[PDB]
Write a protein that binds this ligand. Structure first.
Ligand SMILES: CS[C@@H]1O[C@H](CO)[C@H](O)[C@H](NC(=O)c2ccc(C)cc2)[C@H]1OP(=O)(O)OCc1ccccc1
Length: 132
């Protein structure tokens, strides 16, 4: 798993660019926007492409409890193909862009101000996480 500290946190206008490869026969992977470094800390966003079930799940986690899942329109990821994702913070939520297309808007469930860390985990071969 990859961890990126957010020394200025995430503000409206902060862009996370995540580049990587979905390996052959990948099951699923995730990008988490976390509210602490501790194992089990709250997730403001859990972005979860599931290649094995052909879904992309969006959710939040508070005090160890998951919220209600949102699902994106289709799966803009392929086993054996590289990807580029933008997670863009606005005042009203996160915009997920995949490749050259706006994909999903996730309304804030936790305060933006609480986000401290970006974690990338699961069956993905990460190239880079950049914060702009
Ligand atoms: C599929 S249900 C649940 O959906 C959630 C979004 O609403 C999350 O995607 C959650 N995933 C996770 O909690 C998770 C954590 C770490 C890693 C490396 C991979 C996955 C995921 O939990 P998990 O995949 O552990 O649940 C299935 C399960 C539960 C108990 C025993 C076996 C499998």
């Amino acid at each position: 798993p990859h961890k990126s500290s957010l020394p200025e946190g995430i503000r409206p206008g902060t862009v996370l660019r995540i580049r990587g490869l979905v390996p052959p026969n990948a099951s699923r992977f995730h990008v988490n926007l976390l509210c602490g470094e501790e194992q089990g800390s709250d997730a403001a966003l859990h972005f979860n492409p599931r290649l094995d079930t052909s879904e992309v799940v969006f959710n939040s986690k508070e005090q160890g409890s998951w919220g209600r899942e949102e699902r994106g329109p289709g799966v803009p990821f392929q086993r054996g193909q590289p990807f580029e994702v933008l997670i863009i913070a606005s005042d009203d939520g996160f915009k997920a862009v995949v490749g050259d297309a706006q994909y999903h808007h996730f309304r804030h469930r936790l305060p933006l101000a609480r986000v401290r860390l970006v974690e990338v985990g699961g069956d993905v071969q990460l190239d880079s996480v950049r914060i702009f």
